[PDB]
Symmetry: C4
Subunit: 388 residues, 4 copies
Amino acid sequence: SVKLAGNSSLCPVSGWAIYSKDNSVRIGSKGDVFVIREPFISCSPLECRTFFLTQGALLNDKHSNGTIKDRSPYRTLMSCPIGEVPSPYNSRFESVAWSASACHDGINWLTIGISGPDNGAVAVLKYNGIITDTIKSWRNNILRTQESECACVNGSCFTVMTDGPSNGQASYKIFRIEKGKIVKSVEMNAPNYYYEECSCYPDSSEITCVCRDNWHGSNRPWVSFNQNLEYQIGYICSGIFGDNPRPNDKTGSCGPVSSNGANGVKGFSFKYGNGVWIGRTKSISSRNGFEMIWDPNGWTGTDNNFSIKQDIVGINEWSGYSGSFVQHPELTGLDCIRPCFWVELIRGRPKENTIWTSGSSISFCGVNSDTVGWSWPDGAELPFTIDK
Amino acid sequence: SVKLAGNSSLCPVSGWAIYSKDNSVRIGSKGDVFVIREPFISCSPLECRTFFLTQGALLNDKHSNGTIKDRSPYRTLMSCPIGEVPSPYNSRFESVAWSASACHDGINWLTIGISGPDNGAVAVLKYNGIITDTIKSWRNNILRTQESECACVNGSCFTVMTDGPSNGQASYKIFRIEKGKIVKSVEMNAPNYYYEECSCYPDSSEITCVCRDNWHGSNRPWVSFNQNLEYQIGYICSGIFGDNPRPNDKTGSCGPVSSNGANGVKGFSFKYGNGVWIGRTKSISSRNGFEMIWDPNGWTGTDNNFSIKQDIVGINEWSGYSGSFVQHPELTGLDCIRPCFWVELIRGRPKENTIWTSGSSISFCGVNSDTVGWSWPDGAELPFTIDK
Amino acid sequence: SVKLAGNSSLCPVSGWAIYSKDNSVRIGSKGDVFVIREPFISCSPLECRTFFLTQGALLNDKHSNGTIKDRSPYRTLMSCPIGEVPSPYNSRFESVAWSASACHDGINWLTIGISGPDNGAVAVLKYNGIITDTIKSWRNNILRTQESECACVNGSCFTVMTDGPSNGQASYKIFRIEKGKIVKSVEMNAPNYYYEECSCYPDSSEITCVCRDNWHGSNRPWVSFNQNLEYQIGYICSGIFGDNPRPNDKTGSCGPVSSNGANGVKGFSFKYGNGVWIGRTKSISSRNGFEMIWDPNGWTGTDNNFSIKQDIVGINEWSGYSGSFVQHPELTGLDCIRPCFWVELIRGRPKENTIWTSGSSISFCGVNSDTVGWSWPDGAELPFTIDK
Amino acid sequence: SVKLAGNSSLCPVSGWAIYSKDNSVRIGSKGDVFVIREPFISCSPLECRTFFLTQGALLNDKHSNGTIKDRSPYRTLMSCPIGEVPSPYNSRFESVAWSASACHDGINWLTIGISGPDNGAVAVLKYNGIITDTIKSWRNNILRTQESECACVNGSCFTVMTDGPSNGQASYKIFRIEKGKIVKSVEMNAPNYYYEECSCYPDSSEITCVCRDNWHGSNRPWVSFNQNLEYQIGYICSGIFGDNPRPNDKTGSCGPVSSNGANGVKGFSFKYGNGVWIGRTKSISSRNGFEMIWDPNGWTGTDNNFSIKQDIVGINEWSGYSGSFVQHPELTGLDCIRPCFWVELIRGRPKENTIWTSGSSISFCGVNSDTVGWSWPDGAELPFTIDK
Ligand SMILES: *[C@@H]1O[C@H](CO[C@@H]2O[C@@H](C)[C@@H](O)[C@@H](O)[C@@H]2O)[C@@H](O[C@@H]2O[C@H](CO)[C@@H](O[C@@H]3O[C@H](CO[C@H]4O[C@H](CO)[C@@H](O)[C@H](O)[C@@H]4O)[C@@H](O)[C@H](O)[C@@H]3O)[C@H](O)[C@H]2NC(C)=O)[C@H](O)[C@H]1NC(C)=O
Ligand SMILES: *[C@@H]1O[C@H](CO)[C@@H](O[C@@H]2O[C@H](CO)[C@@H](O)[C@H](O)[C@H]2NC(C)=O)[C@H](O)[C@H]1NC(C)=O
Ligand SMILES: CCC(CC)O[C@@H]1C=C(C(=O)O)C[C@H](N)[C@H]1NC(C)=O
Ligand SMILES: CCC(CC)O[C@@H]1C=C(C(=O)O)C[C@H](N)[C@H]1NC(C)=O
Ligand SMILES: CCC(CC)O[C@@H]1C=C(C(=O)O)C[C@H](N)[C@H]1NC(C)=O
Ligand SMILES: CCC(CC)O[C@@H]1C=C(C(=O)O)C[C@H](N)[C@H]1NC(C)=O
Ligand SMILES: *[C@@H]1O[C@H](CO)[C@@H](O)[C@H](O)[C@H]1NC(C)=O
Ligand SMILES: *[C@@H]1O[C@H](CO)[C@@H](O)[C@H](O)[C@H]1NC(C)=O
Ligand SMILES: *[C@@H]1O[C@H](CO)[C@@H](O)[C@H](O)[C@H]1NC(C)=O
Ligand SMILES: *[C@@H]1O[C@H](CO)[C@@H](O)[C@H](O)[C@H]1NC(C)=O
Ligand SMILES: *[C@@H]1O[C@H](CO)[C@@H](O)[C@H](O)[C@H]1NC(C)=O
Ligand SMILES: *[C@@H]1O[C@H](CO)[C@@H](O)[C@H](O)[C@H]1NC(C)=O
Ligand SMILES: *[C@@H]1O[C@H](CO)[C@@H](O)[C@H](O)[C@H]1NC(C)=O
Ligand SMILES: *[C@@H]1O[C@H](CO)[C@@H](O)[C@H](O)[C@H]1NC(C)=O
Ligand SMILES: *[C@@H]1O[C@H](CO)[C@@H](O)[C@H](O)[C@H]1NC(C)=O
Ligand SMILES: *[C@@H]1O[C@H](CO)[C@@H](O)[C@H](O)[C@H]1NC(C)=O
Ligand SMILES: [Ca+2]
Ligand SMILES: [Ca+2]
Ligand SMILES: [Ca+2]
Ligand SMILES: [Ca+2]
Ligand SMILES: [Ca+2]
Ligand SMILES: [Ca+2]
Ligand SMILES: [Ca+2]
Ligand SMILES: [Ca+2]
């Protein structure tokens, strides 16, 4: 075992090849599948795994009732192999958690699991399953983190957490973690900005995070930083607005776009010089559909012109959260860090007549070979037996 | 860990010893068993696995409704250990797929998973579960592949894909794949021939495939080739016709036999000089029964005389797809490549009064020791609870 | 990895410590557990496993109907870790089989699985899961074998099979198998004797088998042999009759005891010079209760006196088949071969009002430390939901 | 593999970080989850596992009826990975038992499983799953042991067993066990003391146990001993009484506190010089709530003054058994033995209107980083379908 180097560049990609689909909700109609949300993928040098926050309940059982609720003591972070349904019979226990991150440094898994009360939550860090550190809410208002993989470069792993309001200015901190021990943190000077649920990736020994502005931005904030936590901040300039909700595409801004700026959805994007691969919902108002857009000047330019669009979920089908993951050269044998993404397909409440809320997933990896647009939706027929 | 050599000849065999049976449909009446079709077996130097295309649904659940349908975004290629029922709790996720192939080169698994729309399908190629290449539809008309194992020789693996009409001339391509990367492909010049769902095996460093003529052939087409994809083509001459449907046995042809030629079923045969071991259904009109027939001049001769018949499934019992798989010397310690086969036992629609279609399997290995004819059918009592 | 020597003597034992209980039937009331009979235990140098003949059906499902039936094409030999319920989700497929044996030579697993028609059945032998030999019925009348572990000495494994009538003189053969290849077999000269379902163990480089006389013996036949298949034969002389059914205990015989001699139950016994540890039912007429008796002159003396009895299952509780297994010094680190046994607890037909027949198990290992008699019965409440 | 040294001292801790939660009862409403009680956690140098005593029945199935009952032949000691639900599909079978202990010496697991009748129970000792010894009841009155992990130092493992009345003076023995073989045992001279369900841990090469006085003590008894089983005895002096039931806090005693002394619950405490970390229920009269309390002079001082209290389960929520477990330097890489604990969250009879009694778990590890009080209760909604 050796540390992931994390020093090559992102592989340039022309399209996205489908990687996994788990059909969890479809299968949970009969089988024993966890009620989950906030799924994400992360890879070691040997395998890729789906992480997810369970609700301590299975689909189509009565304890699935009320799972629209975000935070409870029943929620646990757990993981299974990519593409498998998250079942009590195939899933490894990670942490007690209603917000979470994980990532593999090349040697062992780091996991971060926040539980406790809204006014004094605690992140428990584990390295190879052993508790190695904790960090407690500093603003006493729902300490929260990525809901996707943390990022590793040369034995140090990096994440972002937020504490404070979700409808106004909050506090955002960046952490450096080595063998599960926080060795440095910095609070971001980001007035008039808002970061949550950061999708962070390594690229040439530095970390880039694209996040959710729930306060007043329908474009996505970003923060990048080096191993010493010296950071830079911005918003994606493209007029192809990345958040949900959002306005129709028009002239963008390098600051937060206030039109339709309140609320949000967890998302991601990949920076390639001045350009950007944007993943987003197809609907401007609800979590429906998904598409990947290549905008060759979208990182720094404000026009709404793009070069490529690839359909992933159709506009009438349910989507939800999305995030980045990467495959490092140590895993693939390439000479670059490969970009991939997952989409959470949220089913049930609040949009459907169920007592429950849960998600299945799909993921894709970046390639330079031929690809195609389509729709790979969840496909469960709601309501279920328990609802009726 | 070492590449499969694939340079020895096929073991001569006098009969077929039963190797597995999963009883998947019988078990899925209560257990959590995927609805599947298109199963196949493939071996590494250490184990044999069953690969299959799920419908993203479990048996006796309402999501099994309409699983007569061949292609959807829910279908996934998964695998389990030979003879186990395909459950979400024992199945390894491979790829998102409504048509597939897989094989092991002696170092890692290659998997091939075709998904997307009928007019622009994409094969995703994975080596050790990492995406390593893609190939897209070149006739825009249901890109499709073997539904059985690809074949490997000295580090290269080979498969066949079809694109175009299923009731006429189509286009047929052969591929050389090393470590999941397509290193060469050739389009077959095969006018008035039709190939699909090819069953391919290695034999003396070369590949022989026996396929399905869905256009106008009630005997089976074949294609053989070397590692440079220089090929030869033909049809099995035996008057013991291999496809289903087909006419009653009579004088054969070394080109397509047009009588009952349209439509077909995936199948296989093994070439031994001028002779041929034929697997086929017992009914001439539907997928019922299965039998193995040794015809010592059937590869190249057109008479309907044969020397050995061994019963596998009784004529009143449902059958379906069948395909070759091999066990290499590296696995067996023999000095030859051992032929084996599997049979898909299809239950439900169109022939039975259910909302669903699914399959169990049985598999047999060639030996020169004493064997017996019998019937090992699926054994499920239809309809199921969900149908009623 | 080294061959089991098999050259030490049986360990002297004063009593039996409980080793495992799986509660299969109790648990299959709700969970997915196989309908099984003919369970047995066998150990490698690293673990012990339960082997069993499934009925290709789960408990409390409709396909359990009619499982009183002994032979069908749906029956499969499968194995799981000792003490775990036999489920499709924890069980490894071994062979298609309605009669069976298995044993580990120190290097790999040998398995023997008989399937096919009553008038021409075939035993398929596998070594590390690969077919290595077959042997076909020689009397065309239900080729059958041990339903317990075969016995291994220095790289050779030994079993017994019977072919012929179950109500009269039949034919009995002994086999020597190396790496799953039959290297020698002999037919026993045993007129007026009858051997089936032999429980065979190694002891000082020779094999001793205690078996079932279904023709005309209420005491148990035995056969012992050396590695060259030179054999000796006899019946257990003790007046503590070991078969079920049997008479009440009285003066025994060194030939078959005809009183209550027809029919039988698979059983075992362990020889210690002139003495014998007999495992048997508590009832003289049905498969109910179980007890272990030490009779210090019972191998060769005909009195009905014994020195020790240890209760295992109470007289009013269901028992069934039993058999020996051993733990070799390569596994335990002892300087002798440890004797152990399992009991099948048969539930359902013909004695209970169900559509099905199945069994759970218990096992014990011989020790010299303190032990106790009790009852560890099956404990399922019959009938089940599917019966009603 | 190397023996756990066990020679470092206990890590000083300032609070408890949440480590796991299995949600077993919530999940067993639909999933296949064992009815259990008496779980506990123990770790090897590679993993932590949950051990528990099943009732040989699954939740929401009719065989869970009457599971208030402590001792039966159906009860088995099994284990799974920490935080996973105890299911037949993820659980290792360990031993047949209605009382148990287990621990890992750095090389293999020792398991201890007591079954048989109340007047002659036998402890079966296993090392790496092989029977290596037994010990039988020496007072004929429910031989019983820890229900928590044994303690290991330099290849010796230690435990405590009780035999005799649970409402008066009984007999208490300590055992030294090497590779599953009892090498020494001592009967405790403890007149007017009562010990059972001991929680024992290593600390500087010596064992400290904190136990349950069921006779006449509402504080907890303790016994500490060296590797030769030379022991010292006493009761925790703190006026913060540790048992349940108990009186309200007031001046303590260094011998048994008779007020509310009869009856009790399994529990634990960690000694740090003259101080003590106490885990206890929040209710004085029933098994409800749980809290950790640091009393810097509570080992040897009788006042009811304490420094730190940390909430674990809220006072209106069901609690139950609790026990210590440790993580050795060999697992953690620390220079001290880390204390952890678990709490059994009992549901059903006698306090709720069900046919069954079962338990889920939560566990916590000691840290010197920031922590928080909260409530992590069982969370199931009773009654269940089977009760109605
Ligand atoms: C899904 O979940 C909802 C919401 O329920 C809440 O969360 C769930 C998970 C549980 O934790 C509940 O306890 C929570 O309430 C369910 O709605 C609840 O249904 C239950 C069952 O009917 C209701 O509980 C009953 O209420 C009865 C009415 O009592 C009230 O008035 C009487 C005077 O008549 C008075 O005595 C009492 O104090 C109440 O004020 C009561 O008689 C009975 O014993 C029982 O308590 C509960 O009120 C409902 N909650 C809400 C918020 O409406 C759904 O039933 C559930 N659906 C499914 C399909 O499972
Ligand atoms: C049982 O068999 C083993 C062989 O595996 C015998 O052990 C060997 O004996 C020879 C001397 O004849 C030595 O050269 C070897 O070193 C021994 N090998 C091992 C691994 O110990 C043993 O003598 C036989 N025991 C009995 C009881 O007959
Ligand atoms: C805490 C505020 C935050 C942003 C509105 O809510 C998140 C939004 C969510 C959402 O918009 O779907 C669901 C997340 N599970 C939740 N996070 C937490 C920690 O509860
Ligand atoms: C698409 C043409 C082809 C031949 C008619 O269809 C096959 C027929 C099938 C059949 O005869 O059973 C099943 C195959 N799953 C299907 N293949 C695809 C890719 O859908
Ligand atoms: C074949 C004769 C034999 C002895 C009567 O029947 C056995 C009796 C059985 C029994 O007495 O319970 C069950 C065995 N499964 C069966 N063996 C086979 C091969 O069917
Ligand atoms: C046997 C006396 C002892 C103390 C009353 O009983 C314990 C009480 C129990 C309890 O208070 O919950 C549960 C334990 N399973 C039980 N132990 C046994 C061996 O049955
Ligand atoms: C990246 O790191 C590797 C491994 O330490 C090193 O050998 C290589 O020189 C580095 N490459 C670049 C481009 O910095
Ligand atoms: C990577 O980390 C190691 C250990 O701290 C350090 O020695 C090395 O200089 C780092 N490498 C680079 C290229 O920064
Ligand atoms: C086949 O290949 C192996 C491995 O490369 C080689 O050693 C052997 O000589 C070859 N066999 C034949 C029949 O050519
Ligand atoms: C099957 O599909 C048809 C068509 O939509 C529908 O009418 C019927 O209700 C379905 N049956 C089940 C069991 O879902
Ligand atoms: C097998 O492939 C390797 C790599 O191309 C090559 O070195 C070797 O010559 C090949 N052997 C044969 C028989 O073609
Ligand atoms: C069991 O099988 C018989 C066939 O003999 C059938 O008549 C009966 O209805 C079946 N019973 C159940 C409960 O399915
Ligand atoms: C054990 O088997 C080996 C291999 O056949 C043989 O050489 C040896 O003589 C055997 N030993 C005994 C004691 O039979
Ligand atoms: C603890 O044991 C280790 C391993 O044997 C030893 O090296 C060390 O000296 C010991 N420490 C103490 C404090 O006794
Ligand atoms: C349930 O358990 C009780 C013990 O409390 C037992 O005596 C009774 O017979 C059982 N009742 C049913 C309906 O199974
Ligand atoms: C640990 O055990 C070994 C083996 O008995 C012994 O020789 C050694 O002295 C022991 N170490 C200590 C510190 O007791
Ligand atoms: Ca927003
Ligand atoms: Ca642009
Ligand atoms: Ca045809
Ligand atoms: Ca011919
Ligand atoms: Ca008899
Ligand atoms: Ca006698
Ligand atoms: Ca007490
Ligand atoms: Ca105090």
